[PDB]
Amino acid sequence: PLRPIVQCQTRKYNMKARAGRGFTLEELKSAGIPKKLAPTIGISVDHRRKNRSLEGMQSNIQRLKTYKAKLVIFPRRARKVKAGDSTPEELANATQVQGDYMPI
Amino acid sequence: VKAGELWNKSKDDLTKQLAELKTELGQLRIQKVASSGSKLNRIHDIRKSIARVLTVINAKQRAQLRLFYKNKKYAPLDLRAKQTRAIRRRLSPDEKSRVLEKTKKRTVHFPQRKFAIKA
Amino acid sequence: RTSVTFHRPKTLSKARDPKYPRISTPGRNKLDQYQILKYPLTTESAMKKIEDNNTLVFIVDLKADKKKIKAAVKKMYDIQAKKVNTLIRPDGKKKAYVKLTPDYDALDVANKIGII
Amino acid sequence: PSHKTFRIKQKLAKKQRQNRPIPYWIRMRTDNTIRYNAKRRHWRRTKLGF
Amino acid sequence: VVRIQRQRRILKQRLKVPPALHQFTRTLDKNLATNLFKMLLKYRPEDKAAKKERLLKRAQAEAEGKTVEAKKPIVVKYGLNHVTYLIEQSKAQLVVIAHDVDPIELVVWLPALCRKMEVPYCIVKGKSRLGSIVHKKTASVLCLTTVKNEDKLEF
Amino acid sequence: GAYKFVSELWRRKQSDVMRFVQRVRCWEYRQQPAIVRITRPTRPDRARRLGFKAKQGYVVYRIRVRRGGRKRPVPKGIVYGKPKHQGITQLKFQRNKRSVAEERAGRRLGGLRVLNSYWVNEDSTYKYFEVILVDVAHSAVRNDPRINWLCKPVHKHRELRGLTSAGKKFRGLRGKGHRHHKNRPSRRATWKRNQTVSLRRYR
RNA sequence: GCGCGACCCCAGGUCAGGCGGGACUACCGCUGAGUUUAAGCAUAUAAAUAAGCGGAGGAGAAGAAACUUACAAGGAUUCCCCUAGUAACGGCGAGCGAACCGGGAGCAGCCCAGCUUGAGAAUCGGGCGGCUGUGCCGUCCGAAUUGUAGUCUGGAGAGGCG
RNA sequence: CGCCCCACGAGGCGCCGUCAACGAGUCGGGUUGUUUGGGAAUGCAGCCCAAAUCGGGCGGUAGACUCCGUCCAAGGCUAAA
RNA sequence: UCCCGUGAACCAUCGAGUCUUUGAACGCAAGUUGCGCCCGAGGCCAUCCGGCCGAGGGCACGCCUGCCUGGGCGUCACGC
Ligand SMILES: [Mg+2]
Ligand SMILES: [Mg+2]
Ligand SMILES: [Mg+2]
Ligand SMILES: [Mg+2]
Ligand SMILES: [Mg+2]
Ligand SMILES: [Mg+2]
Ligand SMILES: [Mg+2]
Ligand SMILES: [Mg+2]
Ligand SMILES: [Mg+2]
Ligand SMILES: [Mg+2]
Ligand SMILES: [Mg+2]
Ligand SMILES: [Mg+2]
Ligand SMILES: [Mg+2]
Ligand SMILES: [Mg+2]
C-alpha cells in the first residue's frame, strides 16, 4: 500500500522527508477516500498522526489524488461494474507494477 | 490357502479353518520334539496361515461393525478416528470459521478488492 | 434426632448405561487350549513317568493354572486328569504333570499323539 | 536363594538363555563380523548384581 | 455447611447492620403482600408453552392477510438492568424488591434510587416467590409500568 | 443499568455498608476451604468487564492466598555466600498474590483454563481472589466466536507461564515507553539479544 | 400429621467429556549461587547467569501507545545496522551500558463490559428424531433476568434528516 | 467460464446540534527488598496509606504555581519479519 | 505352482488388523505374578424360572455440563 510524505523528527533529520505509515483521517476524508475503504484499495490509514501544516496536508492530498488517478480496480463480480470499478478495456492492460511506483 | 479365497467364505467355515489350522500346528509342534526333516518346515507356513485367517476374521468383523455403528451413531473408542491427541482436540472447521457480526459485516461490506495501477 | 452424630444419608445410584460400548468387538479367547497345551515333553526321565505313574508331561503356557490345564486336557485328547502338578522349569517355561484317572491309559494316549 | 521371588526367577530364566556360544552357522552368513560371543557371563566371575 | 450457614445468620444478628442494609428486615406485611401478589399473578409474563402459539398463529395473518392485528400485551417487567432502566427514566409505576438478594449489593441502592426519583417501592419477602411470578428461579426485582383500565382503582 | 450503581458501591470500600457486608463475608470465607467452587460471581459487574458471561462453562473459583512476603527457604536461615546474599527475612516474591491465586487454581483445576481473576476480600492473614475459568470443551464455549481464542493449543496453562491480566503486571508489561522497554519481548529475551556478540561474515 | 419454590451443599462405577506424563535445540514464568575479576576484600564483578521448580507451540513471547520527542515533529509488535563501548552507572575502582533519531527486513488490525428488545430471550446447551453430515433442521428438557444475544470501543458513537 | 441478481435492513458519504456512559484495594503516594544504565529511586513485589470525571498518566533532578506538548491505563485476541 | 501371474521376495511402501506384563497407569498393593468387589456372553443340574463353573469386561483421582437420589427453620411461602 501507499505511504505519506512526512518529515523526520529530531533536529538532525527534520529537513529530510521520508515515508510514513498512513495518511491521516483528514487526508483520507478530504481526498474522497473513506476511512474503512482506503486499506481496501491499497492506501494505508493511520489514525494516530496529526497534521499541523497546510503544506503537509496538501502534499499528502496530492499523493492521494495522483494515486486515485492511476489506480484501477476490478469488479467484485464479472459483469457487475459498480461505482469505483473500472472499464474492461482498462482492466485488460493492467500489470503488476514493481518497485517504488512513487519515489519520495 | 489364499486370502482371495478366505475373503470369499462364510463365517462358520472361516471358524472351522481356524480350528483346523491350530490342530495342524498342534501336530507339527508335537513332531518337532521327536521327528524332523520336511514337516519341521511346514510349521512356518501353518503359523502364517493362522495369522492370515485371524486377520481375515478381524478385518471382516470390524468392517461389518463399522457398517453397523457407522449409522452416524455414537462410536466406540476402538472405532473413533484416532489421529493424535492434539488433532483430536483441535477445533472443527465450522468452529474455526466462527466470527462476529461486526467482522462478518466488515467482510460482506468492504472486502479486500483487486487492484492494479497505471490507469 | 436421636444421636449427636450426623452420619451421611443414604442416596441412590444407577448402574452404568453407556450410550456407546467402550469395546465393541468380542474379546477372543487367547489362553485357548492350543496355547495352553504347547507340546508334551519327551525326555527319558518323563518317558519313565509315562509308564510308571500313568502321567503325561506337557509344557504349558506360562500363565496357565491347574483349572485351565485340566479343562484343556479334557477338550483336547478327550480324557480327564485326576490331578495336575505344575512347576516352572528353570529355563523359563512351565511344565505340567497331568495324571490320568486310571480309566484311561497313558500308554494309549502317548501312542495316540506319538511320544514313545 | 531357595526362596526366590517369581520376578527374580523370571529374569534368571532369561539370563540363562543368554548363555550359549554363538551358533556354528552364523559364522558363515554373508559379510559377517560376529566372531565369538563377547557377552558371556560366568557364575563365579561376573555377578549379575541383581 | 450447615454449621457455617447457622453462624452466618447468628453473626449477622450480632453485628450492627448499617441503615442501608437495615432498611431490609422491614418487609411488606403478609396481608398487603398477598393482595399485591394477586395482581402480580394476574399479570404474569408469558409461558414457554404459550409463546410458541402466539408466534405460530401470526404466520397466517402475515401470509394471507399480510396485516398485523396485535394490540399491546401488558405484563409485569423484571430483571435488574431493565428495571433500573425503567426506574431511571421514571417509567416504573410500582417497584417490588426482594429482601434476600445475595450478594446484597445488587439491591442496596434501589430503595434510595426509587426514593430520590419518587417511585413507589416495596421490599417484599422471597426472591424465589418473585421468580415464580415470571417463571424464573429468581427475580430479585419487579416493576409495573401500566395496568388494565378494568383495575385502576384496585391498583 | 445496574452495573454502574454496583460499581461505585464497590468503589466506596471504606463506607460502612461495605465494611459490614465485607467483614461478614471475610468470616464466611475464612471458614470455608481454600479453593472452592462458587456458582455465581460475587461481583457480577467486575466479572462482566473481565469477560465473565452468564454462559455455561465459565466457572468461578474462590482461592484463598496468604499475605506477606517470601522468606528464603534454606536449612535454617543459613545462606552460604557473601554478605550481600546473606539475608533471609525481608525478601519479596516477584509475582503478585493475584497471580499466585491464579497459579494455585491452575494446578488444582487441570482440565479448565484460567481466564481472569479479581479481588473480593482480604484481611491481615489472607487475600481472596475469585478466578474466572473456562471449560474449553463444552459446545457453548467452543461455538462462541469471542472466546474460541482460548481453545487453541498455544493457551495451555496461561497462568503457569504469565499470560493473564495479573500475569502481565508482574511481568512488567503494563507500560510502553522507556521505563518498560527492557520487558519486551521479555526481560530474558532482551538480555539474550543484548548479549549476543554479533560476528558478521565480513566483519 | 402436610404437600412446596428457591439457596447452599452431598453422594452417584449416572449421560457425554476435558486434566496429569515424555524430549530439550530454540521460547515463557518463578527461583537462584559460587569459583573468577577486583593483583587482598567486605558493595561491585562473575550474573539479573550455571544448577533447581514449572508451561507451550512449530515457533513462543510482544503488539495497536495512559509512547517518544521539543522537531517542519513522528505513529502498533518484532529482528538486523548505526546510535555506542556512547549518556549513564560504579569502593566514579576493576568495570558496566541501554534507549530515542535514522537506514533496512515485514507490515494488519481488531472485540468486548457499560445507558440503549421489553408489544417479545430475539441467545446458548443436552437428549431424541430427520437430512444435505466439521454442520442444518423438528420436538422435549435445561441454562440465563445476579443478563445470553444485538449496537458500540474514543479514530468514535447513539439519534434525525438526505 | 454457467445459472442464479444483489434493498427497503445494514454500511458509506453529507448536514445538525442534543446527547456522548471508556475497565477500583485499580492508579497514585509512603516505606522495605530485589532489579536496572535508569541517576531525590527503571521495573517488579510485599505491607500501610488510598482515588478521581472542568478528570488521569508522561515531557529522564526532588518541589509549589502559570502556560504548553502529549496520550487515556487498570479486560482480550492478532499472521510476516 | 512361486512363473505370459490374484504373483516369490530378510523387497519398497501404507491406509486394513493384532498389539502379552508394565509404565502418567488408574481396584488396594508391590523383594507379592499377593489380595478384593461388580457385570457377564455360554453350559450343568433344578434346593424354585435358582444356584454353580464361566469366555470376556469392568471398579482410580481432581474436574466441567446435565440428570437422579438426598441433607440444613440458610430464605421462604402455604398448612396441619
Ligand atoms: Mg507349585
Ligand atoms: Mg567370590
Ligand atoms: Mg548461596
Ligand atoms: Mg581477588
Ligand atoms: Mg590473584
Ligand atoms: Mg581470597
Ligand atoms: Mg549486570
Ligand atoms: Mg537452567
Ligand atoms: Mg503469540
Ligand atoms: Mg565510535
Ligand atoms: Mg531475584
Ligand atoms: Mg525501587
Ligand atoms: Mg529501595
Ligand atoms: Mg497476547
Automatic annotation (TrEMBL), chain A:
Residue ranges of coiled coil: none
Q: Which Gene Ontology molecular function entries are recorded, alphabetically?
A: RNA binding; structural constituent of ribosome
Q: Which UniProt keywords apply?
A: Ribonucleoprotein, Ribosomal protein
According to the lineage, what is the superkingdom?
A: Eukaryota
For this protein, the parts annotated as crossing the membrane are: none
Question: May I have one GO cellular component term?
Answer: cytosolic large ribosomal subunit
What's any GO biological process attached to this entry?
Answer: translation
Record-stated family: Belongs to the eukaryotic ribosomal protein eL13 family.
Name used for this protein in its record: 60S ribosomal protein L13
Task: Give the classification, highest ranks.
Answer: Eukaryota, Viridiplantae, Streptophyta, Embryophyta, Tracheophyta
Q: Which residues of the full protein are shown?
A: 53 to 156 of 208
From TrEMBL, chain C:
**UniProt source species:** Triticum aestivum
Gene that specifies this protein: LOC123189664
The entry's function note states: Binds to 23S rRNA.
Citing just one GO molecular function, the answer is: structural constituent of ribosome
Name-wise, this protein is Large ribosomal subunit protein uL23 N-terminal domain-containing protein
Q: Which family does it belong to?
A: Belongs to the universal ribosomal protein uL23 family.
Q: Which GO terms describe its biological process?
A: response to high light intensity; translation
Cellular component terms per the entry's GO annotation: ribonucleoprotein complex; ribosome
Query: Keywords in UniProt for this one?
Result: Ribonucleoprotein, Ribosomal protein, RNA-binding, rRNA-binding
Q: Which residues form a coiled coil?
A: none
Task: Give the quaternary structure.
Answer: Part of the 50S ribosomal subunit.
Upper taxonomic lineage: Eukaryota, Viridiplantae, Streptophyta, Embryophyta, Tracheophyta
User: Region Disordered: start and end of each range?
Assistant: 7-27
Q: Which domain of life is it from?
A: Eukaryota
TrEMBL record, chain D:
Q: Where is this region: Disordered?
A: 1-15
Q: List, in alphabetical order, the GO biological process terms annotated in this UniProt record.
A: translation
- List the GO cellular component terms: cytosolic large ribosomal subunit
Instruction: List compositional bias (Basic residues) regions by residue number.
Output: 4-15
**What top-level branch of life does the organism fall under?**
Eukaryota
State if Ribonucleoprotein is listed as a keyword: yes
Segments spanning the bilayer are none
Keywords from the named record: Ribonucleoprotein, Ribosomal protein
GO molecular function terms here? structural constituent of ribosome
Membership in a protein family: Belongs to the eukaryotic ribosomal protein eL39 family.
Question: What is this protein identified as?
Answer: 60S ribosomal protein L39
Please give the first and last residues shown and the length of the full protein.
27 to 76 of 76
Automatic annotation (TrEMBL), chain F:
- GO terms under biological process: cytoplasmic translation
Name one matching Pfam family: Ribosomal_L15e
Which SUPFAM superfamilies does the record match to this protein? Ribosomal proteins S24e, L23 and L15e
Q: Which residues bind Mg(2+)?
A: Y80
Q: Where is the composition biased (Polar residues)?
A: 192-203
What the entry lists under NCBIfam families is as follows:
PRK04243.1 (NF003269)
Family, per the entry?
Answer: Belongs to the eukaryotic ribosomal protein eL15 family.
Q: State the protein's name.
A: Ribosomal protein L15
Provenance organism: Triticum aestivum
